[PDB]
Every structure is written in structure tokens, then in C-alpha cells.
From a paper:
ABC toxin complexes (Tcs) are a class of α-pore forming toxins (αPFTs) that consist of three subunits capable of assembling into a single protein apparatus with the ability to shuttle and translocate toxic peptides into target cells. The two [name] termed Xn-XptA1 and Xn-[name] are the targeting components of each complex and display variations in insect specificity. The [name] are the largest subunits of the complex and contain a translocation channel with hydrophobic loops at the end allowing for membrane permeation. Upon TcA binding and an environmental pH change, the complex undergoes a conformational change into an active state in which the translocation channel is exposed and pierces the target cell membrane.
The second strategy we implemented to alter the host tropism of Xn-[name] was to substitute a full [name] from the homologous TcA Photorhabdus luminescens TcdA1 (Pl-TcdA1) into Xn-[name]. Regarding the domain substitution, we decided to substitute the Xn-[name] [name] C (F1659-G1787) for the analogous [name] D (A1643-N1752) in Pl-TcdA1 due to these RBDs being closest to the membrane before pore formation. This was achieved by excising the sequence of DNA encoding the TcdA1 [name] D and ligating this sequence into the scaffold sequence encoding for Xn-[name] after excision of the homologous [name] C sequence. High-resolution structure determination of the Xn-[name] [name] C chimera was achieved through cryo-EM single particle analysis, yielding a final high-resolution structure at 3.6 Å resolution. Structural analysis displayed a stable chimera in the State 1 conformation, indicating that the full [name] substitution did not have an allosteric effect on alternative domains. Upon further inspection, the Pl-TcdA1 [name] D within the Xn-[name] scaffold was mostly identical in structure to Pl-TcdA1 wt [name] D, with all β-sheets being conserved and the loss of one α-helix at position N1651-G1656. When the Panc1 and MiaPaCa2 cells were exposed to the Xn-[name] [name] C chimera Tc, we observed no significant difference in cell viability for both cell lines. Due to the structural integrity of Pl-TcdA1 [name] D within the Xn-[name] [name] C chimera, we conclude that [name] C is not responsible for host tropism to Panc1 and MiaPaCa2 cells through the process of elimination. Furthermore, we display the capability to substitute alternative RBDs into the Xn-[name] scaffold while maintaining structural stability.
Residue numbers in the entry:
A (entry chain D): 1 to 147
B (entry chain A), C (entry chain E): 2104 to 2201
D (entry chain D): 1028 to 1370
E (entry chain D): 1518 to 1957
F (entry chain E): 1126 to 1223
G (entry chain E): 1322 to 1565
H (entry chain C): 1811 to 1859
The structure:
Amino acid sequence: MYSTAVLLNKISPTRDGQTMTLADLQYLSFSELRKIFDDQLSWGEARHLYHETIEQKKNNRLLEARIFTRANPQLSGAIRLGIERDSVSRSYDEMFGARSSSFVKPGSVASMFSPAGYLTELYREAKDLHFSSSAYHLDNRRPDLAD
Amino acid sequence: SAQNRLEKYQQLYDEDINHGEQRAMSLLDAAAGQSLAGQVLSIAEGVADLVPNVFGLACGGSRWGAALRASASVMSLSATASQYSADKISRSEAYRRR
Amino acid sequence: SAQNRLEKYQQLYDEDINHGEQRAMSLLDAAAGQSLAGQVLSIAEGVADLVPNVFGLACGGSRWGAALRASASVMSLSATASQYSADKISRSEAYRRR
Amino acid sequence: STWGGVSRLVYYPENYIDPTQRIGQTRMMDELLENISQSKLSRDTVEDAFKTYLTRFETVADLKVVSAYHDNVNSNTGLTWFVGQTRENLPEYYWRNVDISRMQAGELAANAWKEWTKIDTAVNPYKDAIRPVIFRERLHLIWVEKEEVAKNGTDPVETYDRFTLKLAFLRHDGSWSAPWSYDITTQVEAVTDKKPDTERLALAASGFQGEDTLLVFVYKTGKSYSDFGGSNKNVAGMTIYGDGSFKKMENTALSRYSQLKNTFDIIHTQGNDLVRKASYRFAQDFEVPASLNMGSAIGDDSLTVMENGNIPQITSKYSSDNLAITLHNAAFTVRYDGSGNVI
Amino acid sequence: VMAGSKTHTFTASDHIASLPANSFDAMPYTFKPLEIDASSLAFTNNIAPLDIVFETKAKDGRVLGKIKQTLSVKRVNYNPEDILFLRETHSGAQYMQLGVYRIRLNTLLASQLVSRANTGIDTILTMETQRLPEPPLGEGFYATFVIPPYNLSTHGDERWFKLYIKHVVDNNSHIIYSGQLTDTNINITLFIPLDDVPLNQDYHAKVYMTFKKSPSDGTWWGPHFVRDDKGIVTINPKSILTHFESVNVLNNYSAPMDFNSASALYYWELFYYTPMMCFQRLLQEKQFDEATQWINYVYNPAGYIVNGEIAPWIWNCRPLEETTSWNANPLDAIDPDAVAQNDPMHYKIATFMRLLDQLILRGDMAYRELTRDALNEAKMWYVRTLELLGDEPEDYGSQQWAAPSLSGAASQTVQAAYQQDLTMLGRGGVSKNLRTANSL
Amino acid sequence: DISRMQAGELAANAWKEWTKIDTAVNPYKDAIRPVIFRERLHLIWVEKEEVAKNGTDPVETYDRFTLKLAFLRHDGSWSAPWSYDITTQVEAVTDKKP
Amino acid sequence: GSAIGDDSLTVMENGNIPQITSKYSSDNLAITLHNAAFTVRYDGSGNVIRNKQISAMKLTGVDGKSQYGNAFIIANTVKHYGGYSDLGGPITVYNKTKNYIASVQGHLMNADYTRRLILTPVENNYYARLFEFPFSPNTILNTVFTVGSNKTSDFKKCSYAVDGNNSQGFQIFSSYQSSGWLDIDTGINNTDIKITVMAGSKTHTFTASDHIASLPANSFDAMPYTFKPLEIDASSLAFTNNIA
Amino acid sequence: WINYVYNPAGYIVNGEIAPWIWNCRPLEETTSWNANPLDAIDPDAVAQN
């Protein structure tokens, strides 16, 4: 019942002279979104923005998974007869170079399911659990973790 | 003696399920099917009994509660069929473990 | 030989309950539920059959003892459901002991 | 391990696809599953099980939708509930629902629908006067039945048709409760002019949420309808409350719901084709929720807290071209308390 | 309370029912009925919001608590063109109509299954059966449009286009198609509805196309279909077709069965899930030949014999062959089946893995006999499986990875840039900064 | 399968074993026959009942004739039968002397 | 039913006559066929042809889209011959009506290396090449090159399509042997799409030039043809055992 | 299932952490609903007091 463009215009500019985009709010919880834009967004607007962000994130994940699946070298392959190259696959390959063909074996640190990815997710989500002033902040008790 | 024991057990394992057990399981399956086969007939009897059956100058005779009795009957039949199927599956699993 | 025996028994213990036993227990539970589900229909049939069903110049036709028969039916259904649930629980306990 | 498995599920679902079980499996598929669950199997056994499954599929897929109801005041949102009837000569009925709000650019995703579910409560409707409704925010089935009864104490014994309105509701565990019964013979005879065989009697039901009641209308199918009440003898009304009691509507009350005539079945002007229109939830001019639960909030520095914020009554009034909203008993409590700390 | 452009503030100084006791414990405040003049609400899609906020602060300026909410006010709309209704054609097809859109409700496959069931069940599970036509959805016709490839000069920057209909039921316009312009021609087949008595005598229906450079309607700027006394929809000669490449009408075409309709679940169960379940059950009991026979209804590397010749298709399951998606929200819950339903390629991979499992089990069973002939049979099974699989690949990107710092890998800017690029790719297609400059 | 006839002798394998019908048929005399429309087997018969007209001071009876049609389903079961009233046609063609 | 065209290039599908009616008036039997329809689609039923050549002919040219109804030169049997690795292989097709060369490939080794299509009759001597086309973007596949002159003989005598040929030696990334040569025309005439019916001694031919309900869109994709009702005078059927 | 009664991490309501500690209201407010718990040996009665 709202329009995402209008709400984004209300939030914009994003401190950088740019229009706010759904990607920039990936990123933060609903409570944070309501707190930061408390002066400009009501309850329904914040709820709609949160739902739209979640939907966009899910769609991006699905698109990436599909692109990776259709480009697996393992299926080359008597099943390759039932594989078709789409326009989206060509666009992704053109934009990101040879990333889509850069598969790695399991057990390597570069894999997205390797413990490196788990550690990155943990650090990304847990970095802001305490204020920078508090002595319990992760970057204060163990400064070396960032390096 | 050990060789004799090995031959006996190998023969038993190779034989696996003989014919009598197959017949018993098929009978249980057929019983489940036959028990399930009566629900449509029960519903038909219930719907048919609602029509009045006396005429003249004293009419009536309809059985008001036919449909509810038919529904109860079909649900009981479903319960019986489920019980039979459970028995058959349990017997099969016991044979596999043996 | 001892290592082979250990591997076999470890695999059997890890597998625990296969799918057929789960299906049998679920079927017994469903049978108990279906058996229990008929009490409301039996009561409704009993209360409906009491209304007179003949008219004209010779009225009546009510079945006087409908309610008591309905009560007997619902109690029999409860007994059957209890039996089914007891069977299911006994089978589960036997599997645990095994 | 758990995070790895959950993350991998999206990219490689084939590692977790089990042919013998799946969320949303239909009942007949399970019936086939136990039909082929014995230890040893033959080609004939599997073929017979597949034939039984085919019988079930043929029974289910031959359904035809007979009634529908939309749970809203407009077509933009809400859920639509359908009741359908089998092809065979049996009183077997099924129901389902769809989410029409998922429509975009004409086509609906297949997951917005719901599988057919059987109704087993001994329904014997007269012709096709059976329909779903949502009153007290749970599903209800409402239908009519016809019996042949003679008046007692008359020397020439004459018979007539008695029409009974039956209403039932769906319980929590999927069972159906015993149905309430009412006598509507006079209304049917009035609106049909004692020719029920030649005229198509039609039934409509709506749920007035504002007053928490159910409105039932019985009418004669036609090309168009005038305003209710007064001289219009083609429509009769009925009101059902929460406890099951009823009340026959009068002309003054009948004229209040004249706007619902747009959701009635009609005979198409171009070609005598019957068209059925799904009923709608009723409202006067605008719909507003009856109550609003504010919730609770935490004050600054975790010192105070507001609780029990609630607006139990919200009313609306549309006079001329002005809409006014009245809030009754807007209340909330303030208490000095911290939500867990040394403070 | 905020209602559209009006803001009303009610303070407890004059609207309080009873001021509570002045104590550190719970103090409940209750208000007399409050009146709001909501005559300035902006109704979009027959629904408008209404905002309510409870505010309380002490003399120090501290906020004792703030509660926000949004109320929904719905406009009652019983207009004849906004009330969905059900109709049934003479062919037996039931369709539910809302405004201009129509949806099929029932199915007619059960009647036609008898011919296949009279012979063996092998006749039922065939691509020919799954390609059966369906009766038309009410009164209307079919049309084919060719959309030209994207060019910057005429289409303009963003590659998005829409197709709207007009002069059906009402005289407004409703969107009937939306899509993205690409570098090749696009073939679109659509079902144009048609009412019994047209509103405009000259043109019975109008279809037009909009993009960035031309986001308007215009006059005679699109195909204007007119129906004669006996079928035969024709295009009005005085209709500009510059935007389209070619627009044709199909006067007798009958669409095949749809695997994305209301009855999609039953079709998928009959044609895909059931043979797979039967094959799995047969395989679990070491009945290999019957399992192969049952799985051959879905996939068979040797092809399928139809009328005595090899069929041109590869997969016997039509939804798998055409990759028809029938799920729009697969990530609402943890469910591999839902994800596979969204993209049915995973079903292809699952079937392939099941076939490989059966072959390897056959090979192991033959190997365990130790007879020379059994050894040869096991060798044949293993060789066949290896030939089916192909040659396994090696690691490629392991040595191309530059190890980043933990702070760098978790940087929000990198994730935001990647998500922005993915969104632009999926929703648009603009290729600004074509090379990604892999050093970033 | 009569197409297998060769110079007058039919091979014994061209026939099919008798199969029972269990759907509660009560035909009048010998007016029961099979048929095939919609390309599946159907059984069609007639039944006779004795019914009196209501609301007549001298209560007179007559014979009501009902035509019933049923069809065979996939798994070998028989569906519920459609019913029609053909009393007028029977009385017309027989001149009320059945 | 369905059928496969010559050289596994095209395929007819969905052939169906849904309505057939009969009328016996006096001593004349007439048969009417309603909505005789079938679809024709360019597709190969499993080979290198469908994977590469058909997709090559579906690409858009530089003179503006289309590429349908043109004359093409293709190879009978093409097989991987050698190189550093076996990629999808540069599969090339010649368009005579516009003098175009369309090349397709499966994958690429690495984006940093310069890549260009090279056609030589010897596959070993770089200086013996007859065709050289640089990829305008390096990381792109399935492009056209617009020779610009009638060089059909040169293309015919040039086997060994090479997808490498850098300037630091040769560096043959991939190479494919073409073997035979075929010439095809994808254009069609409305008088060659016919239905012929034999009834006893009578033969009736109905062409799409006059019995077509609506001519479909001229495209490489599926093209459905539908026919108006067809009348057959079957008064000369030879009835043996009451069936003809 | 046990999180419906006690959860050390708190309970999310409307997108924010709820102020209460125990999700069971009688436990949170310590409501006593038994006046004679020592009439017989019964741990449940004592706990109810």
C-alpha cells in the first residue's frame, strides 16, 4: 500500500549525495532501522522497508545460486545435453569476469562454506554488539582480530 | 561341525522369506482393501434411506439419522483398514530383522 | 572376525528404527484417532432419531431408545481407541528394549 | 556443522531430496506408500497399487467448484475460499483456499493455492445451495436441506416441503462440529412464490465483523435485483449471533444491506448462462479494526516502562462526505522499572 | 494521530478520564473518547494508513517511553467490475474472472486418462499425454508478439518494457505483461480476452507497449483487434506497429496443459513424484530390473521409442524438459523440496544421481559373487557408470585467491557493492563499469 | 475377442474368465445389460417398486420403474449408480400390462 | 505425432487433427478435417549440431537482427583435434547472403590472454592463415565478424578453426576439424508446406498458400501452422471387410 | 518448547526485546493459588502455594 521509491526519496540523501538504495539497508535489524529513521518514517513505513529488504536479499541469493548451479563444471557430463545458456548467465559472466567458473574443491579456505566464511559471518554480525565506548567491545579486548 | 553350521545358516539366509509368509502378507493386504471397499456402499445406503417409505393417507417413514450413522460406519471401516495395514507392515519388518 | 561382528552390531545400533516401523506406529495412531472421531456423529444420530417421522392421521414413529444406544456406541468406540493406543505404546517400548 | 548444512541447502538441495517423503505430500500418495511398504514386491503388486492411486486421482481431479467466498471488503487483499463437489452421484464435498493478493500481471504462482480437503459431516444439501463463510474468524459451512412433511390433524392429508438451514464450523484438529438448525420454510415459500421447482433458489452468506454477526440471504435467481426490503418480495434475510441464536430481519433492517446485491448470482443478459459471484464480508462504508494492541516500550536509560497500551474500541462514521473515527478507552500504564541491570 | 495531512494532538490536561495515583508503582492513564476528522486520507488500492503515537516525557525531557503504530482503513468496493465471479464454458472448463484477468479452476485430464489406462500404464506416462491441449478459457483469442532487441537510441537506457490491454470490460488500461529487453528477439504468446458485446464498435480490443522513451498510450499506436461474426480476429489496418517487430493472431491454436496452474500439484505428483517413489521403493528391495523400468518413465539415456522411432526430446517429464517453475517463495522456510520446485534443474540432478546409485549398486552386487562372469558384469557396470559421469575436473580458483584481512572480508561496503550489482543485474541490466577490476 | 475367429473355430485363449459384480443390483426380471460409453464398461438395468399416490381417499397403488446406471472404476470397484424415472415410458410402450 | 528433419536440423511437433467429421449425402461420402495444425522448430535431437551450429545461426547480425531466411555453410562432422585444452571449441558458420562468420564456444581458459578467431588450412603455420578476427571484448562468446566480401571458397577450403593464436608463438588454445561441408537455406515457400491425402484412387493436395488460417511469425523458434477445414471427396474408397 | 516459559536471552515482541523476564505471567507476578498445601504429602501442592 506504500511505494518504495517514495520512502527511499524520504530517506535520501545517504550522507554521500546519493539516493538511498535497498542494498545499503541489507544490513541492520528492524529495531535499528526504526531507531535511525525515527524522525522520518512511521511504523508501517519501517515495516514495509524491512519486508522489501528481506525480499530483495532472498531474490539475490536465489539468483546467485541458480547462476552457480548452471555453470558447474562437474556436469560436463552426459547431462549437459539438458543445459541451456540464459541471457542472465551471459550478463553475469560479462560483468564479473571468470568468477562464475572459479570453482574450488571442498576443504580449501576459499570455499564459501569453509570455516573462513563462518568466521567472517561471526565477525560481521558480532562486531557491533557493544558500543565503542564500552570496554567489552570486541575490537577493544582483542584488537588483533581485525588483522 | 563348524562347516555344517555354516552350510545350514547360509541356506537359511539364502532362502529368506518362503511362500507361506508371502501368502499371509498378501492376505492381510487383501483384507485391508476389502474393508476399505465398503465406504461408498455405506454412504449410498445412508443417502437412500432418507426417502420416505410409507404412502396412502398416513405418510412419512423417513429415517432422519441415516447419514450420520453412515459416516460413523465409514470412519470405523477406515480405522479397521489402518489397523490391518499396520499389522502387515510390522510383520514384514520383523521378517527383515530376522 | 571380531571386527566384522563389531561393525555389524554398530551399524544396527546406529540405524535404530527404520521407516517401516515408523509407518506402522503412525498408522496405529491414525486408527485410534479415526475410531475416537465418531462419538459426536453417534450422539447427533441419537438425538436426531428421536423426532417423530410419520404424519397424517396416524402420527408417531419416534425411536424411544436412540440416546442410550448412542451412548453405548460412543463408549465402545472409546474402548477401541484405548486398545489401539495401548498397542502402539507396547510396540514402541519393545523397539526400545531391542 | 548446522550452519554449514543450512547454508548448503540452498545451493545443493539434491543432497537432501528424499523420494519417499516431502513437505506437502498428498494423502493418496501416502496411501500408495503404505500400499507398497511390504518387504518383497512384484510388478503386479506395484501395478495394482498404481491403479488404486489412479482411482483416487480420478476421483479428486473431477471436482467442480460450486461456491466461493472472499474474506475481505474488497478484492485487493484477503483469502478466497472455494467449496467444490464431485462428479459421482454421492454427497461428497471438498474445500480449498487461494491467496488472490499474490496475483501480479495476470498469472498466479502455483504455491498460492491449497490442496483439496474433504468434508465428512453428513451434508445433504438441496441442489447446490451450500457455501462456505468465515464468521467468528473460523471456517463455517452453511447449506439448506429439504424434507417432505404432512400437516397433522387434517382429514385430507396434504404434504409440503420443509426447508431447514444448517450451519457447522471447523474445529481445531480438523473435525467438524454438530450443526445448528433453523426453519426457513416461510422465507423460501415467500421469495419463490411456492414454485421451488421452476425457480432456482439461491443462498448467500456474509460475515459482519463490526457487530460480530452472520447475515444470511435467500433469494430467487434473476437478471438483476432492486433495493432490499419494502416492496421487493424476492429477497429474505436472517441474522445469526455468536451463541447460535437467530433473528428474522424486518424491512428497516433489510434496507440497511441493500449494497450487498452486487454480490448475488445472476443470469447473464447475453446468453442465458448462470454466473456465480463470491460473497464478501460486509461493512457500512469503511472497515477499521475493532481494537489495537499498542504493546510495550522501554524508556530512556532503562528506567521506566509503558505497558498494557490498548485501544479496545474503534468506531467509524461516514456522514455525507466526511469520515470520522472515534477511539474509546485509550489506556496505558507507566511504571518505574528497569529491564534487567544494576539500575 | 496523523491522518493524511492532518495532525491531531490530544493531551491529558483536558482529555483524561481520571488521573491516577501519584506513586512510583504502576500508574494507569485512561482517556475519554477521541474524535479524529479523517477526511484527508490518501486511498491507494482502496486502503490508507493512519498513524497513532503515544508520547510521554517528564520535566527533565527524558522520554519515559514511545510507542508507534499504523492503523489500516479499508474502503468498501462492490463495483460490478471489481467482484470476481465464476463461469463455466460449454466445453466444461471453469474459470474465475476478476476485472480483466481470468484463472482456470478445474481440470479435464481424468476423462482423457481412460484411453491410456485401457492399454498398459506405459501409455499414461508419456510426453504425448502431458502435451494434451485444453479448452480455451472463456471467450477470446490468442496472439503472438515479437519484441525487437534492445537498442539505446530508441528504447533508452533502462531495458524494461510492459504490455497493456485496453477497451475490454472497462475503458481503462491494465498491465498484462512485463519483462526485460535483451539483445535478441523475444517471442511472446498471450491469451487476449474478449467480452460478449464490445464497447467500441470499431476496435474490440487494443494492446500497446511501453518503455522508457515512450511511457504513454497514444492514438492508434498498437494492434487493434476486431472480431468478425464468425471468429477470425483481424488487425485494424490503421494501426501503427513501429514499436513491435511483428504481431500475429492464431485463430485456432489451443494451448497445451499448464504445469503452473491451480492443479499443478496433482500433475507433478502423477507424472514425476509417483514413478520416482515407486523406483526408490523397488530399489530398496533389490529389484533392479523393475526399478529401471519404473525410472525410465522420467529419464532414459537411450531415448524413448514413439511410434517406432526415437523421440526428439531428452527428458520424458514435460515440466523438467521445459523447466517450468511453479513456486515463487522457496526460502520462506527450510525446505529442499521448495527450492527444487522453484528451479526444477535440481530435480534433473537428483534423478541423475539416483540412476548412478542404482548402477553402482548393481556393480557391487555383481562383484560380490567372485565368479569370472560376475567380475566381467561388474566391470561392465562400472565402465558404463564412468562413461555416463564423464571426466572429473580439478581445482581452478584455489590459487587465484588473495587472502584478505578479517576486517576487509567482513567490510559492509564490499557486501553492499556486491548486492547492488546483483540487484541491478536481476532487475535492470545496465552494464556500467563493465569490467569489475578484480583487484577490488 | 471375436476378431480371432478363423474358419469357425475360436482359440480358447480369446475368452476371459468370469468376474463377479458386487454393487447391489436388483434388476426386474432380466432387464440388465452391459454397455460401453465414455470407453469404459457400464452396467445398466431397471428396477420395480410398489408405490401409492399420496392424498387420495381410495388408496390405489402402482408400479414405479427406475432405470439405474453404474460404471466400473480403475481398481475394479463399482461406483454409485445414477437413477432416473421411466415409469411413463414403460407404461406407454407396454399399455399398462407389464 | 512428430518427426525429425534432414541432418538432425529441424523437427515437426504437435501434429494433430482434433476434429474429423463425415457426411454421407445420396451416394457421396465427404470427410472434413478441422484445425489441422503442426509446429516446425529448428532444433537438433542431440549432437554437436544443436549445441553449437543452431545457436550460432540464432545470433543477431550487425546489419540488424534477423539472420532468418539466409543461406548458411556448415560442417558435416566436426571433432576436437588438439590444443592446450579442449574448450567448447570455436564452431564457425558462414552466412552467404550477408558474408558473416558466426563463432561459438563453450568456455575460456583465462581472461588476461588475448583471444582471436583464426582460420588456417594447415593448423600449424600461423603465416598460412586465411582468416583472422579479434574479439572486440576479450571475455565474450558467440559473436559475429562480418568478413565483408564473398570468400565462400576460402571458408570452404579452410578447416581447423583455432581459438588461440597469440603473438608470443602460436599458443593454440583449441582447434576443431571440420571434415565435410554442407550448404543450407533456411528460407521457406508457402507452396512447399502441403498436406496430401490419398483416398482410394483420388489424391488431394492442399498447400498453405490458400488453405492457411494464419501464417505464423517468421522466426527461428517454434512456428505453428494451422489450416482451415479441409474437404475430401472419399467416394472411391475400396471397402474390404467393411473397412477402408 | 521450553522457550515459551523461560529464555535467558529474552523474548522478541514486535521486533524489540520484551521487558519481562519470565514468559509465564503467574510465575512473573508470583500468583499463589492454593491455601492448604500441607493437608497431604504433595510436592505439587507446595509448589502451587
